[PDB]
């Protein structure tokens, strides 16, 4: 089981009790997609939902 990591590009505070707080530069272990625009992941031990359009694209 190898890792699937991504990097937060923009901060985000939760609007529902299942959501993660995102801080710029945070590295999330991705679980999967739940809905358009919404992924589940693990960040600092907590599993929760986060907006996928707040994640940094890899462009070199």
């Amino acid at each position: 089981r190898r890792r699937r990591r991504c990097q937060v590009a923009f901060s985000y505070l939760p609007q529902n009790d299942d959501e993660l707080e995102l801080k710029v530069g945070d590295i999330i272990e991705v679980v999967g997609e739940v809905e358009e625009g919404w992924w589940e992941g693990v960040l600092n031990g907590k599993t929760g939902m986060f907006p996928s359009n707040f994640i940094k694209e890899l462009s070199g």
Binding site: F10, Y12, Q15, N16, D18, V34, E35, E36, G37, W38, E40, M49, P51, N53, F54
Partner: peptide, 11 residues
């Protein structure tokens, strides 16, 4: 700032 999409689905 980006805009989050609407949500309906949860675990």
């Amino acid at each position: 700032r980006p805009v989050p999409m609407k949500r309906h689905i949860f675990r």
